[PDB]
Every structure is written in structure tokens, then in C-alpha cells.
Amino acid sequence: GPVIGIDLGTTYSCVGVFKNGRVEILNNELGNRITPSYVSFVDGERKVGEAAKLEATLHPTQTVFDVKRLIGRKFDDQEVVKDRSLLPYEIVNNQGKPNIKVQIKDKDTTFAPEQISAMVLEKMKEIAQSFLGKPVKNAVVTVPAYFNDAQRQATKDAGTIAGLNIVRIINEPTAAALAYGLDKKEETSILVYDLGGGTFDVSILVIDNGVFEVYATAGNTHLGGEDFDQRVMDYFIKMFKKKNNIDLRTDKRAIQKLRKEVEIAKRNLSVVHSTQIEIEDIVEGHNFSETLTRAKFEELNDDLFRETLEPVKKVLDDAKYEKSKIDEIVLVGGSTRIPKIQQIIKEFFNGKEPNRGINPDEAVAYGAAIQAGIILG
Ligand SMILES: CSC[C@H]1O[C@@H](n2cnc3c(N)ncnc32)[C@H](O)[C@@H]1O
Numbered sequence: 001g002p003v004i005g006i007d008l009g010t011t012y013s014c015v016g017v018f019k020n021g022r023v024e025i026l027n028n029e030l031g032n033r034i035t036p037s038y039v040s041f042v043d044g045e046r047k048v049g050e051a052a053k054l055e056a057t058l059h060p061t062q063t064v065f066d067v068k069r070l071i072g073r074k075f076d077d078q079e080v081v082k083d084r085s086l087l088p089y090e091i092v093n094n095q096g097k098p099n100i101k102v103q104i105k106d107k108d109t110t111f112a113p114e115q116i117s118a119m120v121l122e123k124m125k126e127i128a129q130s131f132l133g134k135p136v137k138n139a140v141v142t143v144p145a146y147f148n149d150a151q152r153q154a155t156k157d158a159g160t161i162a163g164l165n166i167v168r169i170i171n172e173p174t175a176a177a178l179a180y181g182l183d184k185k186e187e188t189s190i191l192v193y194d195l196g197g198g199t200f201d202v203s204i205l206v207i208d209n210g211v212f213e214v215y216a217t218a219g220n221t222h223l224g225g226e227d228f229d230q231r232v233m234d235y236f237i238k239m240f241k242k243k244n245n246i247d248l249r250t251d252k253r254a255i256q257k258l259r260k261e262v263e264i265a266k267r268n269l270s271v272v273h274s275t276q277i278e279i280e281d282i283v284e285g286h287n288f289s290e291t292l293t294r295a296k297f298e299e300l301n302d303d304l305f306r307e308t309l310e311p312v313k314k315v316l317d318d319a320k321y322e323k324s325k326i327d328e329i330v331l332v333g334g335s336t337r338i339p340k341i342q343q344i345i346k347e348f349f350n351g352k353e354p355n356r357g358i359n360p361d362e363a364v365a366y367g368a369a370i371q372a373g374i375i376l377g
Pocket residue numbers: 009011012034195196197198224225226263266267268270333334335336337338361
């Protein structure tokens with residue numbers, strides 16, 4: 001049968017297939033190659049992807065996301081304690097493990113993380129099945145290099161619930177290295193810098209005659225593009241209050257519309273220097289109309305950008321590496337498109353240029369699909 005490749009991210013998933021010697025990253029029903037990893041339990045309907053994410057504004061307790069943060073962990077782990085204080089849906093202690101509690105037609109329903117991750121995997125499986133026009137029973141799925149055996153097994157269990165035999169778990173750094181086609185001959189040390197929507201991961205990956213080994217990993221579990229958007233949100237909320245005596249935080253719908261336009265403005269500012277943020281009637285009778293510059297975008301976030309270097313120094317220290325020991329720098333995650341991120345990494349490495357792709361949000365899924373192709377021969 002076919003074997004598909006799935007990047008099960010914290011904020012998103014992405015599915016690719018290997019067919020007729022090419023990787024195709026597939027579109028969901030809304031025509032997008034990235035699917036938000038959200039599941040909503042509102043009004044007797046279950047939604048997965050963007051349609052669930054849209055429910056978060058008016059139904060925050062019924063809209064599940066970031067389940068990757070919980071999968072395979074214990075309820076009393078320090079990281080899960082923090083996530084429970086951050087996440088708006090109820091997390092319960094089931095025999096020492098975090099479970100998710102929502103209502104379906106007002107009835108309390110509890111799910112293991114792998115049950116919610118399975119719903120995400122089912123949607124990715126259906127995209128592949130529709131594209132390939134045949135059933136899919138096997139996948140390569142990605143995990144973070146820091147995932148332990150329980151976190152990997154819980155991911156495989158998510159696959160089994162979705163009717164996917166996970167034939168190989170590959171770490172996210174290896175997937176990136178397969179996607180960029182890094183030479184497998186001889187010995188190469190690679191710094192894989194992965195800045196996503198919610199999480200930052202850095203790894204030292206060494207490739208030695210076709211054998212991949214992650215020598216060290218570090219990161220920031222609560223640092224990504226969503227935090228850069230919030231810094232911009234915070235600034236324009238203060239400004240709109242100064243100018244109009246309106247606190248936009250008082251209207252959740254107003255915040256949802258602003259966040260959407262701020263994320264587009266931020267993407268624009270990876271290519272241009274000035275962009276307009278515009279919402280007609282952000283509240284009734286009050287337009288939002290502002291200019292954001294790249295300089296102001298960077299000023300609002302430059303502490304968060306520089307914080308990404310602390311895990312870089314940690315992995316170099318863990319591996320007993322000089323900066324010079326790194327042969328190539330590979331950027332993954334959409335947020336590596338920010339010009340200042342690229343500049344900061346270049347300058348830390350005493351002037352050495354990072355390799356970046358052109359679809360860095362899809363590189364991990366792409367490498368998972370390559371791994372599927374490798375396994376089939
Ligand atoms: C799945 S990675 C998606 C993350 O990358 C960010 N991202 C994608 N493209 C860009 C871009 N052009 N500039 C800045 N951030 C981007 C998105 O805003 C989100 O935070």
C-alpha cells in the first residue's frame with residue numbers, strides 16, 4: 001500500500017505523498033497546505049482544522065489545540081502544570097496523565113491526547129486518500145528530537161486510532177535534513193533552527209555516511225510567530241485606546257479580526273518595509289487603520305528574536321562544539337522568513353550564512369514523505 005508522510009506540529013499539521021518520483025504536499029478542503037491542529041466540540045458538531053480554530057473566539061473551553069504539549073506526559077510534570085494554566089479547555093488528571101474534558105451535547109466527555117491527535121491524523125489520511133484515490137493504512141510521522149519513548153509511543157497510538165500504522169517515527173531534524181537533501185556521505189554537523197507558530201527548537205544533527213544522530217537539542221516551548229503577533233496586538237491595542245477611548249480587549253470578535261490582520265501584516269513585512277492594517281468597523285462605527293513598519297515590528301520583538309540564541313548557545317555547549325564546528329545552518333518553520341531572524345543567526349555564527357528553503361513551513365512534512373519513499377524502495 002502507500003506510505004504517506006505527516007508533520008504533526010504543535011500548531012499545525014502537513015501531509016505529503018511520494019508519487020511518480022516527486023513529493024506532493026497536499027491541500028486540505030480549504031486549499032491550504034498547512035492545517036491548524038485544532039478540534040472543536042460545539043453544538044453537537046466536531047470540526048477539525050481552520051473551521052475548529054474559528055470556534056476558539058466564542059467557544060474557548062470547547063476548542064482543543066496544542067495537544068502535542070500534553071501527549072505522552074504526566075499531569076504533574078512541570079511543563080503540563082504550566083500548559084494547564086495557559087490552555088482554556090479543561091485538563092483532568094486521569095491516573096497520573098493529562099486528559100482533555102469538553103462537552104458534546106452538554107455531556108462531559110474526556111479524551112486522551114492521542115484521541116485528539118488521531119482526529120488530526122484522520123483528516124491528513126483522508127486528504128492523502130482523496131488525492132491518491134486509494135486507502136492509506138501506513139505513514140511516517142515526525143516528532144521532536146527531545147520526545148521520549150512514552151511521547152513517541154503515544155504518537156504511534158494516535159496513528160493506530162486513526163487507522164494508520166506508523167511504520168517509522170523520524171525526528172524533526174532528520175526530516176529537515178532529508179528535505180534539503182543534505183549530503184549523506186562523509187561527516188557533516190548541521191544546526192537545525194526551527195521557529196514555528198508556537199515553539200522554537202534547535203538541534204545539532206550529525207550525518208555520518210548515511211547515519212543521522214541528533215547530538216544535542218534545546219529550545220523554548222512558548223516562543224514562536226504567535227508571540228510576535230501578540231507583541232504587535234499589544235502595541236496597537238494601547239494606541240487605539242489612546243486615540244479612540246476604546247479598549248479592543250473588551251470585544252473578543254474585535255481581537256479575532258485584529259489578530260488575523262496582524263499575522264498578514266507580519267508576513268508582508270518579511271518582503272516590504274511598510275504595510276497597512278485595516279479592519280472596517282472593528283467595533284460598530286470605528287474603523288481600525290494603522291501602518292506598521294518593519295523597524296517597529298523588529299523593535300516590538302527584538303528581545304524575543306534574541307532569546308532564540310540562548311538555546312543555540314546551549315546546544316553548542318551540550319555538544320562541546322565551537323561555532324566553527326557547524327558546517328551548515330538549516331532554517332525550518334514559517335517564522336524563519338523574518339529577515340531579522342536570519343540576520344541574528346548569521347551574526348551569531350561570526351558572519352556565516354544560514355541555508356533557508358523557500359517553503360520552510362512544509363520542509364518537515366516534505367522530509368517525512370522522502371522517508372516514506374526511502375522505506376518503500
Ligand atoms: C507552521 S509555521 C507558521 C508560522 O510561521 C509564520 N510565518 C509564515 N510565513 C511568514 C512570513 N512570511 N513572515 C513571518 N512569519 C511567517 C506564521 O505567522 C506562523 O507564526
